[PDB]
C-alpha cells in the first residue's frame, strides 16, 4: 500500500510515501495499439535487464478489479531525485569529474544493453535519471529496438522521425540503411558535449537546420555517405552547399579537457562504423579513473524483439501485458 505526494514529464508519475518511491500510472493502457505495444516492449526490456545503470521495475500492482475492467497499469520504481537535464541546466555543480563519472555510468549501462542487441534510440539527458547517491540510470525504453525491425512500422522507412531531433544520429536523419548500437553512441556524444558546455550541442529548429548545425562542426559528409542518402532532395541539398572541413573540437569547446575531446571526437562521426563502441569507450584514458572490466558486465542472453513484430490486436496485447505482470510476480513469490 502507498500514499501519493505530488505529480513529478514522464507521464502520470507520482511521488508516493510507503521510505519514498515512484509510482507510474499508465492510464487507458490497452486503448491504443501503439501505446499498448510500447508498454509490452518496455515491460519485457526492463524485466530482461538487471543492471545498476538501468531503471528497474520494483513492483507492478495486479488487477484489484475483474479482467475486463482492468484498464490501467501501475508500475513502482525507486525514487530518483533528478535527471541529467535538470542537473546540467541548473545552478548545481558540474565539474569535469561530474562529467567523467556521469559519462562512465552511462557507458557502463550501454555496454550491457548493447551486448543484448538492444538499441535505446532516444538517449538524452532527461532520460538519464540520477538518484541522491549519484547513481545514473538509463530509462524510457519505449523507442528501443533490435538490429532487425518489421516493415509494418512507419519508423522503418521514416527514420528521420525516430526519437528526439537534437540527439538523432545521422543514419536516422539521412536514412543510411545502417541501424546499429552506433545510433546510441552519437546520442552519447551529444550528451557528453552538452555536459562539457552546459548547453545543447546541435539545437536544430527543423530537419534542415539540424543538418546545417551538424555540418558546421563535422564538415560536409563524404561521397560514400552522400550517395547512401535515400532521399534525392536531401542528397541534392547537401551537394548544393559549399565544401566545409571539420571544425576541431578544441575550437568548439575552448579550454576543455584533452582526453575528453579525444573521446568525444571518436563518438561524433557521420559513419556508424567509424564510431567507438560503448565497450571500447570504457577503455579510453578519460574513463581510466573508474574503469574496471571485472565490474562492467555484458548481458546474456540477447533480447529478442519478435513479439513486437507480430501484428497483434489491442486485446491480444492486453493479454501479453497481463501475462508479463503475472510472470513478474510468479518468478519472485
Ligand atoms: C525527477 O523525478 C523523477 C522522475 C521520473 C522518475 C521515474 C521515471 C523514469 C523513466 N520511466 C521509465 O523508464 C518507465 C518505467 C516503467 C514503465 O512501465 C512500463 F514498463 F510498463 F512501460 C514505463 C516507463 N516509461 C518512468 C519512470 N522513475 C523513478 N523515479 C523518477 C523520479
Experimental method: X-ray
Instruction: Give break positions in the chain: residue before each, C–N beyond 2.5 Å.
Output: 8, 18
Ligand 1 atom with the smallest distance to the CA of 129 is 9
Whose cell is 576541431? That residue is 248
Read off the C-alpha cell for 222. 563524404
* CB of 290 closer than 6 angstroms to any ligand 1 atom: no
* Contact yes or no for 136/187 (Cβ under 8 A): no
Question: How far does the centroid of ligand 1 lie from the alpha carbon of residue 78, in Å?
Answer: 9
Q: Torsions phi, psi of 197, nearest 5?
A: -105, -10
Residue from 301, 97, 119, 275 nearest 190 by CA? 275
Resolution (A): 2.3
Distances (CA, A) of 80 to 56, 91, 132, 135, 286: 12, 19, 7, 9, 27
Question: How far does the centroid of ligand 1 lie from the alpha carbon of residue 58, in Å?
Answer: 11
The dotted CATH code for 1-79+313-330 is: 3.30.200.20
- Closest residue to atom 8 of ligand 1, CA basis: 10
Residue from 266, 306, 258, 299 nearest 282 by CA? 266
- Residues annotated within the binding site for ATP are 8-13, 24
Instruction: Give span(s): CATH 3.30.200.20, the chain.
Output: 1-79+313-330
Q: Is 146 helix (H, G, I), strand (E, B) or coil?
A: coil
The dotted CATH code for 80-312 is: 1.10.510.10
Q: How far apart are CA 239 and CA 237, in angstroms?
A: 6
Instruction: Give span(s): CATH 1.10.510.10, the chain.
Output: 80-312
* CB of 83 closer than 6 angstroms to any ligand 1 atom: yes
CA-based Rg of the chain, rounded to a whole angstrom? 21
* Contact yes or no for 91/278 (Cβ under 8 A): no
Amino acid at each position: 500500500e502507498y500514499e501519493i505526494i505530488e505529480t513529478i514529464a514522464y507521464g502520470v508519475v507520482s511521488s508516493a510515501r510507503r521510505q519514498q518511491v515512484a509510482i507510474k500510472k499508465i492510464p487507458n493502457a490497452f486503448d491504443v495499439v501503439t501505446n499498448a505495444k510500447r508498454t509490452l516492449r518496455e515491460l519485457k526490456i526492463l524485466k530482461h535487464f538487471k543492471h545498476d545503470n538501468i531503471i528497474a521495475i520494483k513492483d507492478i500492482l495486479r488487477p484489484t478489479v475483474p479482467y475486463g475492467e482492468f484498464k490501467s497499469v501501475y508500475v513502482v520504481l525507486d525514487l530518483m531525485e533528478s535527471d541529467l537535464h535538470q542537473i546540467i541546466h541548473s545552478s548545481q555543480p558540474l565539474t569535469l569529474e561530474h562529467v567523467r563519472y556521469f559519462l562512465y555510468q552511462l557507458l557502463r549501462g550501454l555496454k550491457y544493453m548493447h551486448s543484448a542487441q538492444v538499441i535505446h534510440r532516444d538517449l538524452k539527458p532527461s532520460n538519464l535519471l540520477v538518484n541522491e547517491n549519484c547513481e545514473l540510470k538509463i530509462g524510457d525504453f519505449g523507442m528501443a529496438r533490435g538490429l532487425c525491425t518489421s516493415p509494418a512500422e512507419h519508423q522503418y522507412f521514416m527514420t528521420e522521425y525516430v526519437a528526439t531531433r537534437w540527439y538523432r544520429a545521422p543514419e536516422l536523419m539521412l536514412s543510411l540503411h545502417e541501424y546499429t548500437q552506433a545510433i546510441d553512441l552519437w546520442s552519447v556524444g551529444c550528451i557528453f558535449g552538452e555536459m562539457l558546455a552546459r548547453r545543447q550541442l546541435f539545437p536544430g529548429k527543423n530537419y534542415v537546420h539540424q543538418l546545417q548545425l551538424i555540418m558546421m562542426v563535422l564538415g560536409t559528409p563524404s561521397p560514400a555517405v552522400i550517395q547512401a542518402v535515400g532521399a534525392e532532395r536531401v542528397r541534392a541539398y547537401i551537394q548544393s552547399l559549399p565544401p566545409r572541413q571539420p571544425v576541431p573540437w578544441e575550437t568548439v569547446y575552448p579550454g576543455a579537457d584533452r582526453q575528453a575531446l579525444s573521446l568525444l571526437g571518436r563518438m561524433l562521426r557521420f559513419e556508424p562504423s567509424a564510431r567507438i563502441s560503448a565497450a571500447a569507450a570504457l577503455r579510453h584514458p578519460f574513463l581510466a579513473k573508474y574503469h574496471d572490466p571485472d565490474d562492467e558486465p555484458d548481458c546474456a542472453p540477447p533480447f529478442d524483439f519478435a513479439f513486437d513484430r507480430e501484428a497483434l490486436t489491442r486485446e491480444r496485447i492486453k493479454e501479453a501485458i497481463v501475462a508479463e505482470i503475472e510472470d513478474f510476480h510468479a518468478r519472485r513469490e
